[PDB]
């Protein structure tokens, strides 16, 4: 029937930022629109998240930073302070009337890529260090030269005991101790370590065996040029005389994955560790770590730190040893997004031959499906969001955009908690990533799939 043609804009189209600066990007509707405006982020291989609806509303769980207003037809989007979490595609979107329509985007570039934090920690760097400390009483010092690729997360190192030696002790429960600048930090992550150079940190540890066996440990860590520089302090005591340390039964550290977080305005990390031990059991230990910058740093969020450490080669007493250590930083949950606790997963995307038919359906869980309306939105290979369908909570009034309208039908089972779409005649336009979400009375799409693929293609 006669509707509205609501073209939304926005402005600019990409731009190129830094961390700290304030970003506005604003749209405009052709023929006023109210209030009822939202905005998402968008960021690379994820769903959209909703931000902000009626222009200036904030969804639960978004940071102050983030910001909105407008009325009529002109709106604005304002971050005041650029973290690195930010850098996504944003779009915005009508709900005064259907068809829905989004914004074509606006893309936010890293200006400069990682140029200003590369003069200072270098892709390769050196390691010089010294660790002096006693084990059961046992009074030594090993010092160690090494080579590594912070950016990737690795680095080996070259360790030998100049007094003490022949140690006492197994050699494993001290190699944790030879730096977390060494661990390769995705984009959306704030890298705590690197930020810290050239001044440094240093981190405080306590390692507490399950036979009760204690170790503390404390490093300063400093830089000058390419060349890290480590004075470590060790110490250990109540190693039982035939424990697997005392009698050297360790074989190697399992890999680990140790959880970061902040309090007290610094960064700690646990981690449960696990000695392999000839014959095959496990000797546990929990580390707690405290990692301090000496100047004020980018706090990040809650992640995870995978970390896998092993001795590549030693003598018979381990005067003499190689040792290497690879780690890498990522969140744990686990593309898709919400602003509470209902999670949808889409299925059937697939392969089809132009006229084909194909059927998408996603399944709810974790709210009560039948109590809200719900929508498929698509996005074509580089291109923006695209409203596609809706239907009320019941099921029984639908709307469609005109691209599928008399092609596509959207339906519902709510005893099963899922939503269909069903696509006839598909042509090469329809080939996208199909998402499910969740439509709020606000305006706002507030839970969507990670979406699934849709691919028209002949001989």
Not at 197 to 219: K, L
Not at 258 to 283: P, S
Request: aromatic fraction near 10%.
């Amino acid at each position: 029937g006669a509707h509205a043609d609501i073209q939304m804009t926005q402005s600019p189209s990409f731009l190129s930022a830094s961390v700290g600066d304030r970003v506005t990007i604003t749209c405009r509707a052709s023929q006023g629109i109210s209030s009822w405006l939202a905005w998402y982020q968008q960021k690379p291989g994820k769903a959209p998240k909703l931000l902000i609806y009626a222009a200036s509303s904030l969804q639960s769980g978004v940071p102050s930073r983030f910001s909105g207003s407008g009325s009529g037809t002109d709106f604005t989007l304002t971050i005041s302070s650029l973290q690195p979490e930010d850098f996504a595609t944003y779009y915005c979107q009508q709900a005064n009337s259907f068809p829905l329509t989004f914004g074509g985007g606006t893309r936010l570039e890293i200006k400069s890529g990682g140029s200003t934090i590369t003069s200072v920690i270098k892709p390769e760097m050196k390691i010089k260090l010294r660790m002096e400390g006693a084990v059961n009483g046992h009074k030594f010092v090993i010092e160690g030269e090494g080579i590594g690729k912070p950016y990737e997360g690795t680095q080996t190192l070259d360790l030998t005991v100049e007094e003490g030696a022949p140690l006492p002790f197994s050699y494993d429960i001290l190699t944790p101790a030879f730096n977390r600048a060494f661990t390769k930090y995705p984009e959306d992550i704030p890298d705590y370590f690197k930020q810290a150079f050239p001044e440094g940190y240093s981190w405080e540890r306590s390692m507490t065996y399950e036979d009760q066996g204690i170790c503390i440990a404390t490093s300063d860590i400093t830089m000058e040029g390419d060349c890290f520089f480590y004075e470590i302090r060790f110490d250990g005591t109540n190693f039982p005389p035939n424990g697997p340390v005392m009698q050297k039964k360790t074989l190697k550290w399992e890999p680990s994955t140790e959880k970061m977080y902040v309090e007290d305005g610094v960064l700690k990390g646990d981690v449960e560790m696990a000695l392999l031990l000839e014959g095959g059991g496990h000797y546990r230990c929990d580390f707690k770590t405290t990692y301090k910058a000496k100047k004020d740093v980018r706090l990040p969020d809650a992640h995870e730190v995978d970390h896998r450490i092993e001795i590549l080669s030693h003598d018979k007493d381990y005067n003499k040893v190689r040792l290497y250590e690879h780690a890498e930083a990522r969140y744990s949950g686990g593309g898709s997004s919400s602003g509470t606790q209902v999670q949808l997963v889409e299925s059937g995307g697939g392969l089809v031959q132009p006229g084909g038919s194909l059927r998408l359906s996603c399944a709810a869980s974790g709210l009560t499906f039948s109590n809200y309306a719900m929508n498929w939105v698509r996005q074509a290979p580089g291109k923006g969001l695209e409203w596609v369908s809706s239907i009320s909570s019941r099921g029984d009034t639908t709307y469609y955009a005109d691209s599928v309208k008399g092609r596509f039908t959207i339906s519902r089972d709510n005893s099963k908690s899922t939503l269909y779409l069903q696509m006839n005649s598909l042509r090469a336009e329809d080939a996208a990533v199909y998402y499910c979400a969740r439509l709020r009375n606000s305006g706002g799409m507030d839970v969507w799939g990670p979406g699934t693929t849709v691919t028209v293609s002949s001989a």
